[PDB]
C-alpha cells in the first residue's frame, strides 16, 4: 500500500506507506571463547600427523599473542555521537579485578548466562566456543609426553575446524583495530544471534522484528575486542535496540526548479533541501536528511536516531503549502540550470533545462515521452527507463498508485531582478527577507530622488538678503526704496 | 599519450590524453547453484570420518536455512538513481509461479542457457555448482542406511572443497543484506565472468574492453541474492554495460586563487568549483564532479554515467577564457587564504599563502624550489616531492609533457571593496552580477547623499518673517531700520 504524490509547484514528491524501525538504544552482550593455556609443545616427533599439529598449534598461540598486543543535504545540521560509548564502557568494567572470574564462573555449567557486573549492569554472556575442553581432552593426552601418541589424521582435521573460528575472529580484529562492523558470522553465528535476541530484555514485537531481519541487525551492530585474561577471551558485541516500530514513514525527494527563459544564464532556480526520510515519532517527526543512512526492506525502513533531527510535526506543511506561515521551509537557490532526474519510489522526477534531451521510454515501445523544459514527473506504470542527457535511469517497478498534484512552479512568483540566487543554506523567509531589503532600497531611493528636484536650492552667499519670487532668488533691496 | 596544461590565470590545470569507458546500462544474469534436499542424517556412527562428515554436512544445511531467512565539489548537483532497480526487477520475476521451473528445465542439459522470463526479458543463466549431484552420487551411499559404509579420509577433504564455495557465497550475503559489491570470485569466478561477457549481447569492442579489465568490471557489478526454491539457489549478477568507449577524456584540477596583500584581513579568494573528470559524449560533455567515482587504468578511465552531468561542449571554454560569453564558469569565493597543494596527473599545483613554508624537492638534491605567495605549478620531471606547511606530498611519476600557460591571476581584476566573499555555490556571471549590483547601490546612494547641503530648510516658527542671506535665515526685521 505504497503511494506517491508529486507536487509540480515545488518540484518534489512524497512516497508513503512505509513502516518504521528506528534504533533507539544499545544492548551490550559479552561473547567469550574459553581458551587453553598451552606454553611449550615438547615433542621431537616427525610424524606427519603430529607435524600438522605443531603448525596448527602455532597458529593458535600466534592468534592469542596477536590478540594480546591489541588490548594493551542537511546532514551537516546533525549532532555528533560516540557510537560505541556504551560498549566500550562495558568493556572498561571487564578489566576490573574479579570481573572475569564472575563471568568464567557463571558459564561453568551452561554456555548461556546472565551476569550482573560490578557497576550493576546485567549483561547476557555467551560461551560460543570451548577450545579449552577440546584441547585438554583431545590433544593434551597425546602431547603429554615427549614420546607422542600419534593421533589419527581425522583428529588433526577436527582441530583445524574448531580452531578456524578463532583464527577468523582474530583476523577481523587485526585489520580493524579491535572494532568491526558489520558483525560477521565468525563473531556471532545466526543461531547465536537468534538466541541472543530471544534472551534479550525486549518486547515480543521487537524479538519478532529482530529475528526476521538479522541481516540488518548485523549491519547495525559492533563487535568490540575487549580482553584476554586467565584463559578467557572475551569480546563485547553491541546490538541495536529498536524502540520504535510500525509508525508511519515517508521519503521526500526533491529536484531543482528553474525558470525556462531563452537567454542562457538569465534563469533563476530553487531547490527544496529538506529531502530525506521522515517518521512520525512521539508527537514529533524524526527527520533523516541523509536518506542513504537508512535501509529499506520491502515496506519497512530501518534508520538510526543518531542520524536524525527532531522536528515539529508542522514541517509536513511544506508539502501542502510551502509559503505557510507556521514553518519556514528550507530551500537553496541558484542559477545552475543543469538537467537531472530523481528516481522516486513509484516514478521519476525530471528537471529538464537548456538544450538537454530528456525522455522516458517503455520496454517495447521505446521513447514514449519527451519532456519539455521545466520540472515534470512520470509514474512507473508503463514506463521502464528514463534518460536525461547522457544518463540512463532504470525506474523502480513496485506496484502502487501515483498522484500528480498540479500547480504553478513557485519560481515564477519571483522577480529575477531582486532574487538572491546564491543562497545555499537558505529558507523561504530568508529569501523573502533579502528580497524585501533590495526592494525597500529601490522604492525609497527612487522615492527620494523624486521630490529632491522639488526643493529649492540655496540662495547666493554674498552678504545680501534674498527673497523668493517667480522661482528665483531676488535681492531684497529691489523691493525697497534704498531704505 | 598524456599531456597537461596549467593555467596561471585561474589556478587550475587540465590533464588530457585519456580514453573513456562509461557504464551506460546494466545487464542482468542469473547465477544458480543446484542444491541437495537433505532432511535427517541417518547414522548412529561415532567414527571420526563420519563425524567429520556430519559436522561438515550440518554446515551445508545451516547455510541453506540462513540464505532462506535472507530472501524473506559539485556532486550535490547530481541526480538520484536506484542502482540495482533493474537487477531487483529480474529477481522479482523469478519469484513468480512456474518461473524457477522454466530456469531449472532450461539448464537441464547445459550449464549455459538463454531463458526468456515471463515478461519477455531474455537473460543468460548459469548453473555454476551442482551440490545436488555431489551428495546424491557421493554421500548418499554412506548416509542412507543403518549399516553404514564408512570410507577413508580423502572424501571428508573433498566434501569441504565443493561445499566451500557455497559457504563463502552464503557468508558474503549474510553481512551485506543480500547485495554485494564488488562481485567477488566466490560469486563469480574469473572464467565464469569472462564467458558471461563472451556470451553477452554486446559488440566486440565491448567484449574486448571488459575481458581485458575484469577487475574493474567486478567493482562496477552487483550480486543480488534472489531466491531459494525447489533445490535451486539463485542470485542475480548485475553487470555494467559500456556503451561509450575510446572517447577523449580530461581531468580538471583546481586550487584556491587568492590575492597576496600584506594585511591579512585584506585578501580575497576565488576557486573554480568545476573540477572533476570530463568526457566527450554524443555531442555533449559528460562531467563527473566526484572524480573518486572514476577509476583510472593507464590512460583508460572508467566512469558511471549515473555520476555525471551532461553539459554543452562550450563548457570547455572555461579553460581558455574564463570570462567567455558562451558558458558561465562555476566558482567559489572566500577570504580564507590557507595553503595547500593539488597533485595533478603530471605535476603539482601549489597554493601558498601567508607565512607558510612551501617547497619542492628532488630525490638526490633536496629542496630545489621555494614557492612565493600565490598560485604556482611544477611538472613532475625532476621533482619528486612537494611540502606545504607540515604536509608532504609525493608527486606522480608518470611520463608526459606539461605546458605552463602564463596569464595574470584573475583575482587581481577585482576590487576587494565590492567583491562578494561569502559565495559558496557561485559562478562568474553571478559574481559579476552582484558587483554590478553593489556598484549600482553606491552610485545611486552617493547621488542621494550629495543632496544634503544644497536645499533650504524651514525657517523658525516664531511668528516672524525671515529672508535668506549667506546660507541661513535672517529676520526681515533686521533690514527695515
Amino acid at each position, epitope marked *: 500500500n505504497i503511494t506517491e504524490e508529486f507536487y509540480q509547484s515545488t518540484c518534489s514528491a512524497v512516497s508513503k506507506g512505509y513502516l518504521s524501525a528506528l534504533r533507539t538504544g544499545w544492548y551490550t552482550s559479552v561473547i567469550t571463547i574459553e581458551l587453553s593455556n598451552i606454553k611449550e609443545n615438547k615433542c621431537n616427533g616427525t610424524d606427519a600427523k603430529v607435524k600438522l599439529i605443531k603448525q596448527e598449534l602455532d597458529k593458535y598461540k600466534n592468534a592469542v599473542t596477536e590478540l594480546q598486543l591489541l588490548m594493551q543535504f542537511l546532514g551537516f545540521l546533525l549532532g555528533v555521537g560516540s557510537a560505541i560509548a556504551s560498549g566500550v564502557a562495558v568493556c572498561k568494567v571487564l578489566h576490573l579485578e574479579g570481573e572475569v572470574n564472575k563471568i568464567k564462573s557463571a558459564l561453568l555449567s551452561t554456555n548461556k548466562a546472565v551476569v550482573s557486573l560490578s557497576n550493576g549492569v546485567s549483561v547476557l554472556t555467551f560461551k560460543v566456543l570451548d577450545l579449552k575442553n577440546y584441547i585438554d581432552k583431545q590433544l593434551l593426552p597425546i602431547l603429554n609426553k615427549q614420546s607422542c601418541s600419534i593421533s589419527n589424521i581425522e583428529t588433526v582435521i577436527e582441530f583445524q575446524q574448531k580452531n578456524n573460528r578463532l583464527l577468523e575472529i582474530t583476523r577481523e580484529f587485526s585489520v580493524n583495530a579491535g572494532v568491526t562492523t558489520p558483525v560477521s558470522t565468525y563473531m556471532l553465528t545466526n543461531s547465536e544471534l537468534l538466541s541472543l535476541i530471544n534472551d534479550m530484555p525486549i518486547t515480543n514485537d521487537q524479538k519478532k522484528l529482530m529475528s526476521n531481519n538479522v541481516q540488518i541487525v548485523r549491519q547495525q551492530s559492533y563487535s568490540i575486542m575487549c580482553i584476554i585474561k586467565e584463559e578467557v577471551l572475551a569480546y563485547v558485541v553491541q546490538l541495536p535496540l529498536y524502540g520504535v516500530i510500525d509508525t508511519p514513514c515517508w521519503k521526500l525527494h526533491t529536484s531543482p526548479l528553474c525558470t525556462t527563459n531563452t537567454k542562457e544564464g538569465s534563469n533563476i532556480c530553487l531547490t527544496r533541501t529538506d529531502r530525506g526520510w521522515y517518521c512520525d515519532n512521539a508527537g514529533s517527526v524524526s527527520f533523516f536528511p541523509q536518506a542513504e543512512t537508512c535501509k529499506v526492506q520491502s515496506n519497512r525502513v530501518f534508520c538510526d536516531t543518531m542520524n536524525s533531527l527532531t522536528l515539529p510535526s508542522e514541517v509536513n506543511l511544506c508539502n501542502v503549502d510551502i509559503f505557510n506561515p507556521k514553518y519556514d521551509c528550507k530551500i537553496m537557490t541558484s542559477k545552475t540550470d543543469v538537467s537531472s532526474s530523481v528516481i522516486t519510489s513509484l516514478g521519476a522526477i525530471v528537471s529538464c533545462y537548456g538544450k538537454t534531451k530528456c525522455t522516458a521510454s517503455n520496454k517495447n515501445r*521505446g521513447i514514449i515521452k519527451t519532456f519539455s523544459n521545466g520540472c515534470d514527473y512520470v509514474s512507473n506504470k508503463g514506463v521502464d527507463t528514463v534518460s536525461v542527457g547522457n544518463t540512463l535511469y532504470y525506474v523502480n517497478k513496485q506496484e502502487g498508485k501515483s498522484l500528480y498534484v498540479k500547480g504553478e512552479p513557485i519560481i515564477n512568483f519571483y522577480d529575477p531582478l531582486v532574487f538572491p540566487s546564491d543562497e545555499f543554506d537558505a529558507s523561504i523567509s530568508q529569501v523573502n527577507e533579502k528580497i524585501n531589503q533590495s526592494l525597500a532600497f529601490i522604492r525609497k531611493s527612487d522615492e527620494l530622488l523624486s521630490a529632491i528636484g522639488g526643493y529649492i536650492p540655496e540662495a547666493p552667499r554674498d552678504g545680501q538678503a534674498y527673497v523668493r519670487k517667480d522661482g528665483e532668488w531676488v535681492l531684497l533691496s529691489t523691493f525697497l526704496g534704498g531704505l | 599519450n598524456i599531456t597537461e596544461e596549467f593555467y596561471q590565470s585561474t589556478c587550475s590545470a587540465v590533464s588530457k590524453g585519456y580514453l573513456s569507458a562509461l557504464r551506460t546500462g546494466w545487464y542482468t544474469s542469473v547465477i544458480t547453484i543446484e542444491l541437495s534436499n537433505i532432511k535427517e542424517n541417518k547414522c548412529n556412527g561415532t567414527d571420526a570420518k563420519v563425524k567429520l562428515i556430519k559436522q561438515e554436512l550440518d554446515k551445508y544445511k545451516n547455510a541453506v536455512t540462513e540464505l532462506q531467512l535472507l530472501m524473506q565539489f559539485l556532486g550535490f548537483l547530481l541526480g538520484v538513481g536506484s542502482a540495482i532497480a533493474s537487477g531487483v526487477a529480474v529477481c522479482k520475476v523469478l519469484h513468480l509461479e512456474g518461473e524457477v521451473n522454466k530456469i531449472k528445465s532450461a539448464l537441464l542439459s547445459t550449464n549455459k542457457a538463454v531463458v526468456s522470463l515471463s515478461n519477455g526479458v531474455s537473460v543468460l543463466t548459469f548453473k555454476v555448482l551442482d551440490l545436488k549431484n555431489y551428495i546424491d552420487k557421493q554421500l548418499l551411499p554412506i548416509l542412507n542406511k543403518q549399516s553404514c559404509s564408512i570410507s577413508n579420509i580423502e572424501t571428508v577433504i573433498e566434501f569441504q572443497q565443493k561445499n566451500n564455495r557455497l559457504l563463502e557465497i552464503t557468508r558474503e550475503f549474510s553481512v551485506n543484506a543480500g547485495v554485494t559489491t564488488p562481485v567477488s570470485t566466490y560469486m563469480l569466478t574469473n572464467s565464469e565472468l569472462l564467458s558471461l561477457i563472451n556470451d553477452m*549481447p554486446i559488440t*566486440n569492442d565491448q567484449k574486448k574492453l571488459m575481458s581485458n579489465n575484469v577487475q574493474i568490471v567486478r567493482q562496477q557489478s552487483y550480486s543480488i541474492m534472489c531466491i531459494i526454491k525447489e533445490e535451486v539457489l539463485a542470485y542475480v549478477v548485475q553487470l555494467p554495460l559500456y*556503451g*561509450v568507449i575510446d572517447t577523449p577524456c580530461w581531468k580538471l584540477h583546481t586550487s584556491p586563487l587568492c590575492t597576496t596583500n600584506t594585511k591579512e584581513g585584506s585578501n580575497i579568494c576565488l576557486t573554480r568549483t568545476d573540477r572533476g573528470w570530463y568526457c566527450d*559524449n554524443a555531442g555533449s560533455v559528460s562531467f563527473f564532479p566526484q572524480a573518486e567515482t572514476c577509476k583510472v587504468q593507464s590512460n583508460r578511465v572508467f566512469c558511471d554515467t549515473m555520476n555525471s552531468l551532461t553539459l554543452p561542449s562550450e563548457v570547455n571554454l572555461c579553460n581558455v577564457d574564463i570570462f567567455n560569453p558562451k558558458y558561465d564558469c562555476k566558482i567559489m569565493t572566500s577570504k580564507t587564504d590557507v595553503s595547500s597543494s593539488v597533485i595533478t596527473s603530471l605535476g603539482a599545483i601549489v597554493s601558498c599563502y601567508g607565512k607558510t613554508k612551501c617547497t619542492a624537492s628532488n630525490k638526490n638534491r633536496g629542496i630545489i624550489k621555494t614557492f612565493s605567495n600565490g598560485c604556482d605549478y611544477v611538472s613532475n620531471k625532476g621533482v619528486d616531492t612537494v611540502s606545504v606547511g607540515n604536509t608532504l606530498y609525493y608527486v606522480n611519476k608518470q611520463e608526459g609533457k606539461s605546458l605552463y600557460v602564463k596569464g595574470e591571476p584573475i583575482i587581481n581584476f577585482y576590487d576587494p571593496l565590492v567583491f562578494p566573499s561569502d559565495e559558496f555555490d557561485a559562478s562568474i556571471s553571478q559574481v559579476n552580477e552582484k558587483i554590478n549590483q553593489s556598484l549600482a547601490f553606491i552610485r545611486k546612494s552617493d547621488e542621494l547623499l550629495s543632496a544634503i547641503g544644497g536645499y533650504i530648510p524651514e525657517a523658525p516658527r516664531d511668528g516672524q518673517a525671515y529672508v535668506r542671506k549667506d546660507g541661513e535665515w535672517v529676520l526681515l526685521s533686521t533690514f527695515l531700520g
Partner: nanobody
Amino acid sequence: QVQLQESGGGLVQPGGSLRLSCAASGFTLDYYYIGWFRQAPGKEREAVSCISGSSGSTYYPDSVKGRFTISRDNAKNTVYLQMNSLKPEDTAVYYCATIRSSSWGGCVHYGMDYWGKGTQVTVSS
C-alpha cells in the same frame, strides 16, 4: 524529426540473398547504436545485428553469424542488413531500431529507443 524506414523485403528462395535498408533522418548516427530485429508470427521479437555508430563494431547472435552482416554508409546516412544463404526459418518481419549510446543497454528489443515499421521477408520453396 526522427524516423526510420526499412525497405528491401520480399520473397526469397532458400540459399538466396537479400539486402535491407534503413534510412535515418532527424539525428546523427555517430551518437547511436543501430540494430536489426525480427519477429516471426506468434513468436517473440529477437535481435539479429547491432553496430556502433561511432566505431562500427558489430554484434551477431550465434544463429545468424556468418550468414548475416550489417554495414553502414555515412555518406548516404543508411544502415544495411545483408542476408546470405537464407533459410525458411528466417521468414519474419525485420525491424530497424536504434538507441543513443549514452543510454546503451545491450542489443535487446527492450533496449531500443526508436523503431521502424518493419518489412516482411519470406523464405519459401
